[PDB]
Amino acid sequence: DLPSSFTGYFKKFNTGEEIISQEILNLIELRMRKGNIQLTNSAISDALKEIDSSVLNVAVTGETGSGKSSFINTLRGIGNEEEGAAKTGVVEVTMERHPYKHPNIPNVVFWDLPGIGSTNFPPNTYLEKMKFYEYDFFIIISATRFKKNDIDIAKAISMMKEEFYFVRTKVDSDITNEADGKPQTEKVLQDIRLNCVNTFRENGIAEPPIFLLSNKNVCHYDFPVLMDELISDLPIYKRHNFMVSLPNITDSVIEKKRQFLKQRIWLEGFAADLVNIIPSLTFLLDSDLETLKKSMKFYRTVFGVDETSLQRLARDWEIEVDQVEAMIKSPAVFKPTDETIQERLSRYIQEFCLANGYLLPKNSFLKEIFYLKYYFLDMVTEDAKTLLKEICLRN
Amino acid sequence: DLPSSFTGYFKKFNTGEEIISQEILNLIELRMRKGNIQLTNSAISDALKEIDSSVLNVAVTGETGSGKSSFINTLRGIGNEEEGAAKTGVVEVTMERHPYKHPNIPNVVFWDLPGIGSTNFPPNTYLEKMKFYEYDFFIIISATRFKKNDIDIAKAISMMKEEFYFVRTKVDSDITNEADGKPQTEKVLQDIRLNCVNTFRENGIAEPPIFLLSNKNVCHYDFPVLMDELISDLPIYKRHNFMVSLPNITDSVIEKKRQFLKQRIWLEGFAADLVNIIPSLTFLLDSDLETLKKSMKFYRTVFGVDETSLQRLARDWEIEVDQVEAMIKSPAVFKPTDETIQERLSRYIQEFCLANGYLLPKNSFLKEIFYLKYYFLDMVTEDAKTLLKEICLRN
């Protein structure tokens, strides 16, 4: 039956890839069996509302000149040259916090916090004037080893039953400087991980795990692990909003993004009344057409394959966007061509259903718009991996 | 007579533009009158030797993340991307000094000094392990206001009868952040100059003058004044080597460079035996031809009009060097063209002497090579100003 099926699509994903908890999924299944379409749709819409309305506030504290402002621009996927991005080299020194919303996901805000050092208030008033209660978790950055200042902040955070994370930036510079001129014969990474703990263990018991990374190289070292760790500690419903905002550094992250978005499509489709009508018949409406345009540009912006991000492969090899656009099939979706869109989308739907079935029990179907979303999602995901390969060979 | 004339060319320059002191010029004039060509030439060659052999060691101390490493690359005229330049963002943290010679003037070495803060030794051993006696003068950098650490270093420097200079970097970021969003109605510069003194005056009496500048904008604010101030405090004979290494930020600096080089040409010409032979006759030798090539590429590298620096106008407007080379007459000197070089240099000499005479009393002349140097020097200087205009309109 339908209740059985909706429950199961959630099962093909991993336990850490759940867009919604098992507590609510069983609540939706229960309502569905009741037969009251009103309450069922409402519960699903509420779940979607909870996810979409979910706000994440990340507080970042750290000594000057470590890479925390560049760390803000890194996760946001923004260069250190833009005006909307955090000032990457220069430091504010306002004793005043400044928020930074994600360019694509406004519900994601990063806070650059003044180091306790150079604050003009006793740490008792430091934390209060900060308003740290509002944040979901803390990120602690240090360019070298973590000093007492940073450590004392950590202890307070741990004491308040909140999560914190130590981030050691500029690891690339250490390896380069230490290795420079020496023979070919990952020792630097091991020395730094101990050095951070050596200062920790001196005053602070039970040194926590520390992540060594480089804001200039998001794809290597412990950068991937940190993102994975942050999501797991976050509440189930909060993972969705944060996940899509993360940098597309690997195929795993890209695929993970696809998986979450796939579940949201499933949810959205179910929130809408199901039908007995097979898609790919007659023509689509302008309203549903515009909704696909908004959904498409949303998927493209998340996987960094949007026209704005298409500006940044043009600089990698000095190659115009058109040339970059040819590799991927994303931009060539809403392009005015002789081959109408009403006849083009009619083609996408047929290929998808023949290869993947209708995803639902016989005689039951999702609205046409939802099947197109799965197709686009798959298309953009594949494009992200294709674009990724070209990116990795350079720089 | 000849003694009278050699003395006078030095007089047409400013008192602060003297490549050599009045104490030695009078020594050269005395020897000349004696008639002993041996001692006279030797004295001049010694003067040239003293200047050329002159070594300058600049120690730079400062708290982390102010712009002192970028300050090293700024004066050297090197980007923050090169390997030979000081690591511009990242910080060494080796508790160990590192030298940086000028790319064109090896006798100019900049030292990035670890802040007293984070040194593991008492300041009594700090100064000693530093070996600060070797430096001619100190540059003190601070990204905001100067702390007790910096101030105590300053007091010790002042106490040792040595010159020091306070440099406040990143002033551009302060003005931008403070002005951001506000109406059109130089207040920021006045507030910072007092803030530096406010911390100074608290413990340190007689606040010294402080220079506000930006490593991202060498041409504006107090950057020009600092260079002028540094040279004046330096010993006469040491000015030459440092001057030519300085960034070509203004016409005044470029003209000043020309003036010093003009005096050196004069000296070099006099060190060589003078003749009764007029130049621009017959043909030049390959040895003198090669000497002109070395002297030309030397002048071009100083005024930043060399082929290496010609790479950096190509990025300003995305314009190939050839296009940049057309504006200036520097690169088109040693280009294989139908119009031989033996006939080309024969043209430069005639135009120069007709417009500027022989610079010496009747029947007396400098060697041909020296007149060509004056011509090239003038040509390169004019090219520097021409190139400067194109640079200033952009960025």
Ligand SMILES: Nc1nc2c(ncn2[C@@H]2O[C@H](COP(=O)(O)OP(=O)(O)NP(=O)(O)O)[C@@H](O)[C@H]2O)c(=O)[nH]1
């Ligand atoms: N090699 C390397 N350099 C880095 C890294 N992160 C930052 N930097 C360097 O440090 C500068 C960035 O300073 P910034 O990020 O503002 O420091 P911060 O950690 O944000 N703290 P603050 O906000 O006090 O400055 C840049 O000039 C850049 O060269 C990194 O991961 N690797």
Ligand SMILES: Nc1nc2c(ncn2[C@@H]2O[C@H](COP(=O)(O)OP(=O)(O)NP(=O)(O)O)[C@@H](O)[C@H]2O)c(=O)[nH]1
């Ligand atoms: N706006 C602005 N930013 C600057 C200036 N100087 C440096 N910066 C910024 O700060 C970083 C440079 O750090 P750096 O120069 O190494 O600091 P420093 O003063 O050399 N001291 P240290 O050697 O300890 O780092 C760059 O990322 C750059 O954005 C300046 O004059 N203006």
Ligand SMILES: [Mg+2]
């Ligand atoms: Mg910041």
Ligand SMILES: [Mg+2]
């Ligand atoms: Mg929490």
Ligand SMILES: [Mg+2]
């Ligand atoms: Mg340095």
Ligand SMILES: [Mg+2]
């Ligand atoms: Mg001195």
